Write an enzyme that holds these catalytic residues in place. Structure first.
Site, PDB file in Angstrom:
ATOM      1  N   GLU A   1       8.046  15.683  -2.307  1.00 28.03           N
ATOM      2  CA  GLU A   1       7.534  14.400  -2.784  1.00 28.03           C
ATOM      3  C   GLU A   1       7.319  14.384  -4.295  1.00 28.03           C
ATOM      4  O   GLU A   1       7.578  13.375  -4.947  1.00 28.03           O
ATOM      5  CB  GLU A   1       6.224  14.010  -2.083  1.00 28.03           C
ATOM      6  CG  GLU A   1       5.785  12.567  -2.370  1.00 28.03           C
ATOM      7  CD  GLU A   1       4.295  12.326  -2.175  1.00 28.03           C
ATOM      8  OE1 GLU A   1       3.480  13.180  -2.585  1.00 28.03           O
ATOM      9  OE2 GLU A   1       3.939  11.261  -1.633  1.00 28.03           O
TER      10      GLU A   1
ATOM     11  N   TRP B   1       7.090   8.473   3.846  1.00 27.03           N
ATOM     12  CA  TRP B   1       7.146   7.089   3.357  1.00 27.03           C
ATOM     13  C   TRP B   1       8.172   6.207   4.091  1.00 27.03           C
ATOM     14  O   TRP B   1       8.486   5.101   3.636  1.00 27.03           O
ATOM     15  CB  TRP B   1       7.442   7.047   1.854  1.00 27.03           C
ATOM     16  CG  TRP B   1       6.385   7.659   0.959  1.00 27.03           C
ATOM     17  CD1 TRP B   1       6.583   8.652   0.035  1.00 27.03           C
ATOM     18  CD2 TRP B   1       5.009   7.290   0.854  1.00 27.03           C
ATOM     19  NE1 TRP B   1       5.415   8.912  -0.640  1.00 27.03           N
ATOM     20  CE2 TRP B   1       4.432   8.085  -0.151  1.00 27.03           C
ATOM     21  CE3 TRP B   1       4.194   6.349   1.518  1.00 27.03           C
ATOM     22  CZ2 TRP B   1       3.080   7.986  -0.526  1.00 27.03           C
ATOM     23  CZ3 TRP B   1       2.853   6.247   1.153  1.00 27.03           C
ATOM     24  CH2 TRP B   1       2.314   7.064   0.140  1.00 27.03           C
TER      25      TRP B   1
ATOM     26  N   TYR C   1       5.031   4.970  -7.814  1.00 27.30           N
ATOM     27  CA  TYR C   1       4.733   6.169  -8.611  1.00 27.30           C
ATOM     28  C   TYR C   1       5.802   6.654  -9.586  1.00 27.30           C
ATOM     29  O   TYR C   1       5.605   6.599 -10.801  1.00 27.30           O
ATOM     30  CB  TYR C   1       4.334   7.332  -7.700  1.00 27.30           C
ATOM     31  CG  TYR C   1       3.107   7.083  -6.848  1.00 27.30           C
ATOM     32  CD1 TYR C   1       1.823   7.066  -7.406  1.00 27.30           C
ATOM     33  CD2 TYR C   1       3.225   6.900  -5.475  1.00 27.30           C
ATOM     34  CE1 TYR C   1       0.684   6.879  -6.607  1.00 27.30           C
ATOM     35  CE2 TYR C   1       2.100   6.714  -4.670  1.00 27.30           C
ATOM     36  CZ  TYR C   1       0.836   6.707  -5.236  1.00 27.30           C
ATOM     37  OH  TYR C   1      -0.261   6.539  -4.417  1.00 27.30           O
TER      38      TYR C   1
ATOM     39  N   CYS D   1      -2.554   5.049  -4.929  1.00 30.12           N
ATOM     40  CA  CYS D   1      -3.859   5.618  -4.597  1.00 30.12           C
ATOM     41  C   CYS D   1      -4.291   6.458  -5.790  1.00 30.12           C
ATOM     42  O   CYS D   1      -5.385   6.269  -6.310  1.00 30.12           O
ATOM     43  CB  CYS D   1      -3.789   6.469  -3.326  1.00 30.12           C
ATOM     44  SG  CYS D   1      -3.671   5.510  -1.795  1.00 30.12           S
TER      45      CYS D   1
ATOM     46  N   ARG E   1      -8.473   5.989  -6.618  1.00 27.00           N
ATOM     47  CA  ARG E   1      -9.222   4.779  -6.286  1.00 27.00           C
ATOM     48  C   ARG E   1      -9.556   4.647  -4.799  1.00 27.00           C
ATOM     49  O   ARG E   1     -10.564   4.034  -4.434  1.00 27.00           O
ATOM     50  CB  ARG E   1      -8.454   3.541  -6.747  1.00 27.00           C
ATOM     51  CG  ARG E   1      -7.068   3.438  -6.155  1.00 27.00           C
ATOM     52  CD  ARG E   1      -6.828   2.079  -5.545  1.00 27.00           C
ATOM     53  NE  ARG E   1      -5.557   2.062  -4.832  1.00 27.00           N
ATOM     54  CZ  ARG E   1      -5.410   1.667  -3.573  1.00 27.00           C
ATOM     55  NH1 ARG E   1      -6.458   1.243  -2.882  1.00 27.00           N
ATOM     56  NH2 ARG E   1      -4.221   1.729  -2.995  1.00 27.00           N
TER      57      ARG E   1
ATOM     58  N   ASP F   1      -8.092   8.712   1.917  1.00 29.79           N
ATOM     59  CA  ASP F   1      -8.391   8.993   3.312  1.00 29.79           C
ATOM     60  C   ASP F   1      -8.607  10.502   3.367  1.00 29.79           C
ATOM     61  O   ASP F   1      -7.667  11.273   3.179  1.00 29.79           O
ATOM     62  CB  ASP F   1      -7.209   8.566   4.196  1.00 29.79           C
ATOM     63  CG  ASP F   1      -7.256   9.165   5.597  1.00 29.79           C
ATOM     64  OD1 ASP F   1      -8.356   9.413   6.144  1.00 29.79           O
ATOM     65  OD2 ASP F   1      -6.171   9.387   6.165  1.00 29.79           O
TER      66      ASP F   1
HETATM   67  C1  LIG Z   1      -4.275   5.592   7.660  1.00 30.08           C
HETATM   68  C2  LIG Z   1      -3.465   6.388   6.673  1.00 30.08           C
HETATM   69  N1  LIG Z   1      -4.097   7.385   5.872  1.00 30.08           N
HETATM   70  C3  LIG Z   1      -3.386   8.176   4.921  1.00 30.08           C
HETATM   71  O1  LIG Z   1      -3.930   9.030   4.241  1.00 30.08           O
HETATM   72  C4  LIG Z   1      -1.892   7.895   4.809  1.00 30.08           C
HETATM   73  C5  LIG Z   1      -1.068   8.603   3.922  1.00 30.08           C
HETATM   74  C6  LIG Z   1       0.342   8.377   3.790  1.00 30.08           C
HETATM   75  C7  LIG Z   1       1.192   9.239   2.783  1.00 30.08           C
HETATM   76  N2  LIG Z   1       0.814  10.746   2.668  1.00 30.08           N
HETATM   77  C8  LIG Z   1       0.258  11.191   1.380  1.00 30.08           C
HETATM   78  C9  LIG Z   1       1.007  11.676   3.768  1.00 30.08           C
HETATM   79  C10 LIG Z   1       0.947  13.037   3.676  1.00 30.08           C
HETATM   80  C11 LIG Z   1       1.304  13.752   4.828  1.00 30.08           C
HETATM   81  C12 LIG Z   1       1.609  12.939   5.869  1.00 30.08           C
HETATM   82  C13 LIG Z   1       2.065  13.259   7.316  1.00 30.08           C
HETATM   83  O2  LIG Z   1       2.418  12.310   8.051  1.00 30.08           O
HETATM   84  N3  LIG Z   1       2.216  14.592   7.666  1.00 30.08           N
HETATM   85  C14 LIG Z   1       2.770  14.899   9.002  1.00 30.08           C
HETATM   86  C15 LIG Z   1       4.344  15.196   8.990  1.00 30.08           C
HETATM   87  C16 LIG Z   1       5.453  14.037   9.040  1.00 30.08           C
HETATM   88  C17 LIG Z   1       6.792  14.369   8.246  1.00 30.08           C
HETATM   89  O3  LIG Z   1       7.546  15.209   8.768  1.00 30.08           O
HETATM   90  O4  LIG Z   1       6.969  13.760   7.174  1.00 30.08           O
HETATM   91  C18 LIG Z   1       1.840  15.943   9.734  1.00 30.08           C
HETATM   92  O5  LIG Z   1       0.884  16.384   9.063  1.00 30.08           O
HETATM   93  O6  LIG Z   1       2.160  16.226  10.909  1.00 30.08           O
HETATM   94  S1  LIG Z   1       1.460  11.269   5.394  1.00 30.08           S
HETATM   95  C19 LIG Z   1       0.927   7.354   4.623  1.00 30.08           C
HETATM   96  C20 LIG Z   1       0.121   6.602   5.544  1.00 30.08           C
HETATM   97  C21 LIG Z   1      -1.267   6.890   5.617  1.00 30.08           C
HETATM   98  N4  LIG Z   1      -2.048   6.162   6.523  1.00 30.08           N
HETATM   99  O1  LIG Z   2      -1.616   9.491  -1.690  1.00 33.22           O
HETATM  100  C1  LIG Z   2      -2.161   8.751  -0.872  1.00 33.22           C
HETATM  101  C2  LIG Z   2      -1.582   7.584  -0.288  1.00 33.22           C
HETATM  102  C3  LIG Z   2      -2.252   6.919   0.659  1.00 33.22           C
HETATM  103  N1  LIG Z   2      -3.498   7.309   1.112  1.00 33.22           N
HETATM  104  C4  LIG Z   2      -4.161   6.567   2.200  1.00 33.22           C
HETATM  105  C5  LIG Z   2      -5.665   6.334   2.038  1.00 33.22           C
HETATM  106  C6  LIG Z   2      -5.832   4.813   2.152  1.00 33.22           C
HETATM  107  O2  LIG Z   2      -6.638   4.518   3.287  1.00 33.22           O
HETATM  108  C7  LIG Z   2      -4.434   4.251   2.386  1.00 33.22           C
HETATM  109  C8  LIG Z   2      -3.986   3.177   1.414  1.00 33.22           C
HETATM  110  O3  LIG Z   2      -4.697   1.932   1.660  1.00 33.22           O
HETATM  111  P1  LIG Z   2      -5.362   1.077   0.437  1.00 33.22           P
HETATM  112  O4  LIG Z   2      -6.395   2.008  -0.167  1.00 33.22           O
HETATM  113  O5  LIG Z   2      -4.239   0.729  -0.521  1.00 33.22           O
HETATM  114  O6  LIG Z   2      -5.977  -0.161   1.063  1.00 33.22           O
HETATM  115  O7  LIG Z   2      -3.489   5.342   2.378  1.00 33.22           O
HETATM  116  C9  LIG Z   2      -4.140   8.418   0.568  1.00 33.22           C
HETATM  117  O8  LIG Z   2      -5.260   8.788   0.906  1.00 33.22           O
HETATM  118  N2  LIG Z   2      -3.420   9.078  -0.397  1.00 33.22           N
END
Ligand SMILES: Cc1nc(=O)c2cc(CN(C)c3ccc(C(=O)N[C@@H](CCC(=O)O)C(=O)O)s3)ccc2[nH]1
Ligand SMILES: O=c1ccn([C@H]2C[C@H](O)[C@@H](COP(=O)(O)O)O2)c(=O)[nH]1
Ligand SMILES: Cc1nc(=O)c2cc(CN(C)c3ccc(C(=O)N[C@@H](CCC(=O)O)C(=O)O)s3)ccc2[nH]1
Ligand SMILES: O=c1ccn([C@H]2C[C@H](O)[C@@H](COP(=O)(O)O)O2)c(=O)[nH]1
Lengths: 281, 281
Positions: free
Chosen positions: B61, B83, B109, B169, B189, B192
């Site tokens: 990423e 994504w 980004y 974020c 900002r 999660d």
């Molecule tokens: C509710 C919510 N909270 C988040 O923090 C969030 C973050 C992302 C982006 N992000 C920063 C992520 C980091 C790691 C991830 C994840 O899905 N890991 C999986 C593997 C899936 C794959 O193969 O890509 C895992 O941990 O099993 S997702 C997308 C939607 C979200 N939705």
């Molecule tokens: O790098 C990232 C990208 C996304 N999120 C999660 C946390 C937020 O709940 C959500 C984005 O929602 P908004 O904060 O934009 O409403 O995705 C993260 O924690 N980190």
């Protein structure tokens, strides 16, 4: 318990764990990177007592920001000459702005808050309807969707940076709402604990009070986050005397009338009650 | 004391003193406003051990960000589906991007880091020489003037916000130098705590290691500052199980070759050493 003790502890921390660094001008500072403090705005206003804070300055500077002005002369005529050095003919010429008039600070704070993205010509140009009004966008969002996590106001504009007489210290601020309370977090990339910081705290605490008044909310907390937190070497002794001082109860801010818009605010609307600051150092 | 205890205490604090707020997803969250943690990067890498973090994902990423790509499919073709949903046909249509081709996330980004201020067309467009290359600027500033207090990289762009499939974020990050050590502070900002934060910590820690390598400095501290820190209601139980586990020593990140530029970095140049986490939950 007292909020001012947090600031005093930060100043103590820098003297205690800081590293000897340098400036752009070359004076010498003690520095720490990354600090955070939380000031309660509930029934009290954070205007430091161990050392007097130029209240008229924070009030007039903020009203000047809201106005969207970038003219230093507009603030100077109010009796607040804190931006005069940066708007002088000598300083503007040393940066390469010779065709630019005196007092023109470039696309600083006020322009970024009200017209983000708009092309900057000069301080006398009309920018109404141009760019993103981040301030009004903040107010509207708090009114329509208070739970939103994107209530941000950014002054750091990489594109407009070369045109600014001075880059923003207060790069970005985010607002938050819970239980009818309005909180605010400021990201300050650089902060002088001796003079600048206490003025900065008051300024954003006032901004939060103002927006809370218009949105019908109560002032919550003010989270002050710092990047480079420094203390100049020639201020080590004065600050040592200030650390020994006992904080007096923070004053109270009172808005004398119900205002509809953020632009309708005036100096007469504000009243500070019970501000007893310590003598000079 | 272990550096991971800061993250675990932050999660505990949100379950204990947090407030039941709402979400844009409407799933419900426990929220706190304004937190800060400091992770030492000196001879160790902040990859959480109480839960296995997808290292391939943070590595792929980041190189995707640096490349300036905004194509989600460009990242998916590497086994990193993080994504995919944000670039799918159904999601783009719901935001009003019916004309956009699959994977086109908008000026996200990568575009903001390399071409801030440039007018976005689509993901397959050439933006060479357009906008402000913030990433390059940071690196050049650290090399020629390390004491500078404006070494900032901003992803928050109010003008481009409505065009982004995924709002930023990690809105802003600042770099700092002392004792030949490079430190970074990130302003998130919204974060999660259950899924995104552990990933984000690793991401910017890796970036610090990358920039520190090119500039000839050593990795210092990674200060993580949060705005709206939250935990989703459905993530409460699995997080209670994570709090129970004991942190194991942080792994070490090794850069296998001497690279001159940020663009010359490839996957073969990195190797995580001594990473023994707990079974994924
Ligand atoms: C509710 C919510 N909270 C988040 O923090 C969030 C973050 C992302 C982006 N992000 C920063 C992520 C980091 C790691 C991830 C994840 O899905 N890991 C999986 C593997 C899936 C794959 O193969 O890509 C895992 O941990 O099993 S997702 C997308 C939607 C979200 N939705
Ligand atoms: O790098 C990232 C990208 C996304 N999120 C999660 C946390 C937020 O709940 C959500 C984005 O929602 P908004 O904060 O934009 O409403 O995705 C993260 O924690 N980190
Ligand atoms: C070295 C340095 N440190 C600073 O903190 C600093 C701050 C500003 C801007 N700022 C945000 C200020 C806050 C308070 C101020 C001040 O001048 N207070 C005086 C009034 C001077 C006058 O009346 O002309 C005072 O305390 O009496 S100036 C400009 C140059 C700086 N220069
Ligand atoms: O509102 C302000 C304006 C300025 N300064 C101080 C901090 C720095 O010491 C100096 C600006 O120098 P740079 O950070 O731009 O290098 O002014 C503040 O603390 N607050």
């Amino acid at each position: 318990q007292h909020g001012e003790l947090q600031y005093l502890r930060q100043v103590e921390h820098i003297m205690r764990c800081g590293f000897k660094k340098e400036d752009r001008t070359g004076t010498g500072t003690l520095s720490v990177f990354g600090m955070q403090a939380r000031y309660s705005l509930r029934d009290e206003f954070p205007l430091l007592t161990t050392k007097r804070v130029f209240w008229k300055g924070v009030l007039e500077e903020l009203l000047w920001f809201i106005k969207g002005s970038t003219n230093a002369k507009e603030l100077s005529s109010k009796g607040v000459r804190i931006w005069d050095a940066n708007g002088s003919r000598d300083f503007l010429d040393s940066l390469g702005f010779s065709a630019r008039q005196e007092g023109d600070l470039g696309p600083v704070y006020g322009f970024q808050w009200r017209h983000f993205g708009a092309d900057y010509k000069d301080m006398d140009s009309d920018y109404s309807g141009q760019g993103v009004d981040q301030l009004q966008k903040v107010i509207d969002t708090i009114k329509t969707n208070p739970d939103d996590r994107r209530i941000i106001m950014c002054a750091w504009n990489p594109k407009d940076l070369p045109l600014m007489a001075l880059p923003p210290c207060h790069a970005l601020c985010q607002f938050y709402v819970v239980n009818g309370e309005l909180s605010c977090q400021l990201y300050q990339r650089s902060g002088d604990m001796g003079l600048g910081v206490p003025f900065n705290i008051a300024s954003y605490a006032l901004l939060t009070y103002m927006i809370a008044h218009i949105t019908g909310l109560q002032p919550g907390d003010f989270v002050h986050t710092l990047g480079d937190a420094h203390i100049y070497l020639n201020h080590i002794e004065p600050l040592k005397i200030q650390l020994q001082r006992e904080p007096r109860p923070f004053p109270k801010l009172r808005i004398l009338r119900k205002v509809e818009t953020i632009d309708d605010f005036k100096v007469e609307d504000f009243q500070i009650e019970g501000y007893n600051p310590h003598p000079t150092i």
